[PDB]
Design a protein around this motif. Sequence first.
Motif, short mmCIF file in Angstrom:
data_model
loop_
_atom_site.label_atom_id
_atom_site.label_comp_id
_atom_site.label_asym_id
_atom_site.label_seq_id
_atom_site.Cartn_x
_atom_site.Cartn_y
_atom_site.Cartn_z
N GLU A 1 0.19 5.96 -0.72
CA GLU A 1 0.16 7.08 0.21
C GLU A 1 1.48 7.84 0.27
N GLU A 2 2.56 7.29 -0.27
CA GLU A 2 3.79 8.06 -0.42
C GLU A 2 3.66 9.06 -1.56
N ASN B 1 8.46 0.88 5.56
CA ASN B 1 7.14 0.96 4.95
C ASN B 1 6.56 2.32 5.29
N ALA B 2 5.58 2.75 4.49
CA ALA B 2 4.91 4.02 4.74
C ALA B 2 3.85 3.89 5.82
N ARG B 3 3.24 2.71 5.95
CA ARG B 3 2.23 2.51 6.99
C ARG B 3 2.82 2.74 8.37
N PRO C 1 0.80 -1.24 0.00
CA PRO C 1 0.00 0.00 0.00
C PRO C 1 0.82 1.28 0.00
N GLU C 2 2.13 1.20 0.28
CA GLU C 2 2.88 2.38 0.71
C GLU C 2 2.94 3.46 -0.37
#
Lengths: 341, 694
Positions: free
Chosen positions: A120-121, B579-581, A116-117
Motif C-alpha cells: 500500500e506504500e 508501518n504503513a498500516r 503488508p506496508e
Amino acid sequence: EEERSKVDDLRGTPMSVGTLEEIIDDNHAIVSTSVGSEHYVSILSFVDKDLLEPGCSVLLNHKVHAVIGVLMDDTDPLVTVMKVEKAPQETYADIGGLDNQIQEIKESVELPLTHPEYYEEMGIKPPKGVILYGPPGTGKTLLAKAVANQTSATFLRVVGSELIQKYLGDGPKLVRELFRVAEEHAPSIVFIDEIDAIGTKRYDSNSGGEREIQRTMLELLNQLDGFDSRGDVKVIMATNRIETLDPALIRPGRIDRKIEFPLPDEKTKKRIFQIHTSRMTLADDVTLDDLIMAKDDLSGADIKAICTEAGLMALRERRMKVTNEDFKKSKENVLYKKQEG
Amino acid sequence: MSMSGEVAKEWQELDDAEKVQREPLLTLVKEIVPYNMAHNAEHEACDLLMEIEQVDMLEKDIDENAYAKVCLYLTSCVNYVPEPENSALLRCALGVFRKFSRFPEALRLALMLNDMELVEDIFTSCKDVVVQKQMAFMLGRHGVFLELSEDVEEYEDLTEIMSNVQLNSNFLALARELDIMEPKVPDDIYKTHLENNRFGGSGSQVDSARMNLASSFVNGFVNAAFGQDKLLTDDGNKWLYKNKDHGMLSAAASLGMILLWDVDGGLTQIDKYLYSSEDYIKSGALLACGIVNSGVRNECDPALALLSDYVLHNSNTMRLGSIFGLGLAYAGSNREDVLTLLLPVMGDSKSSMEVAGVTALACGMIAVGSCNGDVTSTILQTIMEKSETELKDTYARWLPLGLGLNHLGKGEAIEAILAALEVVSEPFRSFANTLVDVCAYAGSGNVLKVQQLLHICSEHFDSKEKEEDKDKKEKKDKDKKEAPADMGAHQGVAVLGIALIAMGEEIGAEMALRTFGHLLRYGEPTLRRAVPLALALISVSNPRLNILDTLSKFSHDADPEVSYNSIFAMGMVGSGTNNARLAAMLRQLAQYHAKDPNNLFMVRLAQGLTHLGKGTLTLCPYHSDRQLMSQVAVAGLLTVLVSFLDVRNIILGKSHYVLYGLVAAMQPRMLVTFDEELRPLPVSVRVGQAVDVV
Ligand SMILES: Nc1ncnc2c1ncn2[C@@H]1O[C@H](COP(=O)(O)OP(=O)(O)O)[C@@H](O)[C@H]1O
C-alpha cells in the motif's frame, strides 16, 4: 436479571426448531418449516432482526410459534471439508536450490498479511494470487511450499471438481459455498490440487455433458472473477498439465504467476537427499553422491522413497542403520520400480 | 552361563543373577562373547541385562554404556545396600570421563540417548539422597549441566567453577539460553543488588588482561550508563593505569562525546520553528510548551534566560518543562547547575506542586547519577525544611523519582520522614499519590521493607493504600514467579491482577497470553478498561502482530475511558517501529465529532508512533508533519487543545537528541513514564500535566 425470569414463561415450556424463510418488510417473518408452517415475528430481543436473513433456521414457540432465538449450526459437510487445521511440521527450508522459485512466491506468500506496508506504500494493488504447475507429477514439493505457508493466516486444500461431477448439477454450488465460506474465514488461503477437469475425461457416478462440466469450471472462475468480490482467500491453483486448462483463466487471476517446476539437477539431488538420510544412520561405505551421481532424471519423491527400501530389510533385521550394500542392491527395486513400473 | 545361549525365547533372563550371585562369579566373559558376537542367535541384546551387572561390579567402563543401549528401562533400578552403589558409582564416574576426550580434543559425544539418558537415569538416584558432585562437573558437557540443577533458590547459584576462556565462552553461552527461561539471567548484575564487590570484580575481569580488545563492553558501557553507581563501583574495580581513569568516567567526557555523536547524525531545527512559535508568543495550553526547550537546547544559555524570565510569572504549571530545562541544559554533560538548581526551591510554603514543587522536582529528576554525594543530603535536608506545606499528596508524587533511580540500595531512607505526613487520611488524592510514592522510593529486595511498612502504616489498615502496597511487594521481586501465587486472592478491586501480570512477569517470550486473556474474559465489567495497560511490558517482543490486531476492535468503542487507555496501551511500546498500516489508520481518526481531550489524545499520540528521536535531516522530512499539524488545527476553532497537540507532536518530534531504544535495550525500564502513565488513566484536570515531563 428479572427479564431472564420473565420471558422464560413466554419461551416456556419448550420451543421448536423452525426454518427462517422470508420476511414481510414490516418485519413479520414468514417461514416455511415442517410442515410448511409460517408465523409473524416482530419481537424486540436478541435481534439483530436484519442479519438473521432469509434461508436460515429459527426456534419457534408452541403458542404461538414466535422465534425467540437463533443459532448457527454446523458441523455439516460444508465446514468439515475445509479443516482442521492443520500446519504440519514441514517448512520451506526443506526444499533447497529451488529458492529462486519460492523467493518469487515469497513476496506472494509474505505480502498478504505479514509485511503488508509496501503493497500500500506503492499502492499498486497486486493481490492477484498464484497459479502453479510443473512436471512430472509435482505439487507436493509445492505442498512443501504450502506446508510453509501454514505459518501465516489459514488454509484449505481441495482436490478437483469431483464434488460437482458426482451428479448432474448441483451447479458449482458446493464450490460456491467453499468459495464464500472462505469469505466467512477471510482472510484465508484456498488451493485446488492438480485440476483434472477436462484433463481427465470420464466421471465417477453420473455426469454430463461436457458443457455442464465445462461451465462448472467456467463458473468456478466467473464466481472467482468476480462480481464484485474483494474477498481473499488468496487463491492458489495448480495443474501439472498446462494444456487442458482454458487459457482465459490466467488474465483475471492469477495473471502474474504460474510457477515453473524445474526437474532436479545433480547437486539439487545432493541437496535434497541428505535431508532424508540425516535421520537414517548410514553405514561406513554409504555415500550420497556416487549413487545419485550416476542416476539421472529422478524425482524428489523417489530420492526420498529410495531410503524406504532400506527401511525394510534393515528393519526386517531390526537395525537402526542403513547399509549401502543393500541400499545399492535394494535401489535396483526402486530402479525396477521406475524402469519396469 | 549356558542358559543365556538357549534358542528358546521363554522369559526371562533378567534378574536371575540376584538369586545366584557369588557362584557365577567364578566364570568370565569368555563364555558370554560367543553368544553376543555370533549372529543368527537367540537372546542377543537380552543377555545384556545380565551382562550389564557383571561389567558394572568389575569397575570396567564404556562397556556398560554399550550394553545399556537396548535396555533403557532396568538401568534405573539395578542391584540394595548403598555402599557398593556409591562405591562402584564414584569409581565409574571417574572412570568414564577418562574414557572420553582421549583423542585428545573431542570429537564430542556422540543429547544422545546413550550417555545423556544413562547419566541422567542414575543422576536421579544421585541427586536423591547420597553423595554429591556427579559427573556433570567432571565430564564438561553442558547438556548434562542443564539436568544437573534441581529446583532451588538461584541467588546462591551465581558462582561456578573457574576454567579457561575457551570453554567459558560456550559455558556462559549455553548458560545464557538456559537462564532466559529462568527468572534469573546472567545479566542480573544490573538489577541485583547483590551490590557486593564480586559482580564488579568479575565484570571488570571479563576482559582481563587484554586492554586493547576491551574497548567494547567497557567504553560503550560507561557512555551508555546513565547512572553513576556503575561508574562508581566499577571505578574501584577498574585497575587500569593509576587514578587517571576518571577522565572517561563520571559521565563527563562520556556524555560530551556521545552528545556530539548525536549532533553528527542530527540535528533538530532550532531557529526556524521556535522563532515562528515566538512570533506566536505563548500558547494557551500552558502545558507542553516548557519541555520543548528542555530537550532542544541543550546547551544554549540565551533561551534559558527567556525560560526563567517567563516562568517567573508563576502562572499554572508551565514552569514544569522550563525549570526542568534549566537544569537539563547544563546537565546535558556535567555536572551541572546543581548550585543554582536547588536555589529556587527554598526561595519560591509552596503551597502546591505547580508553584514551588517544580524546581523542587528539578534537582531530583535532573540529577541522574547524583548523589555525588552532596545532592543526596542536600535534597534530604531541603525536603526536611518544608513539610506541612507540601504536604503528603501532590509533590510527594514526583519526589521518590529522584532517589531510587540513581541508587536502589542507598542507605539513606527518605521514606520514613516522608511517610510521617500520611495522617491526612484523604482517600482520593492518596491513590495516585501513595502509588508510585512508595513504589519509586527504592527497589528494596530484603522482604523486610514490605513487612515493616505494612505493619507500621496499616496498624489496622488503610483499606485502600494496602491495595497498592501489595502491588509494591509484587513490584519489589522482579519476575520471581511468586506473583501468580499471590493472585489467588483476586479482590473485587481487581487493580492487583493488572499490575501483577504486567510487572510480576518479565521474560523474552510472551507466555502471558493465557493469563492476560483469562483475566479479561473472566473479569467483571468495567475492568476491561485497565486490562490493556499491561501492554507496556510483555509486548516488547513482537507488538506488530498482537497490538494493532487486538486494539483495533477496542479503538472504535464509544467509551472515552477505554478509548483513552487503548491508544495509551499501544503508547510507547508500539512507537519504536513504523508501518504503513498505522499511517493509513490515521485517517478518519481526527475526523470524529467527539469532544473531550480523548479525541486529540487518541490521534496525536498515534502520530508519535512514526519514529522516536529520528530525523529530520537525515532522515524523514518535517514538512509532512508541519502540513498535518497545520491542517488539523483549523477546526473548532479553539478548542485550545489544537494548540496543545501542535506543540505535542513536536515534543518528541523536534526534541530528538535521545535514542530510545527502548528505553532500554540494556533492559532497564523508564521509571518516570510508567508512574506518569498511571495517573491520567483518570485524567480530570492537572494530572496529565505532570505526565508531560516525558
Ligand atoms: N529438498 C527436499 N527435501 C525433502 N523432500 C523433497 C525435497 N524436494 C522434493 N522433495 C519431495 O519430492 C516429492 C514430489 O512430490 P510431488 O510430485 O509434488 O507429489 P504430488 O503428486 O502430491 O504432487 C515431494 O513429496 C517432496 O517430499
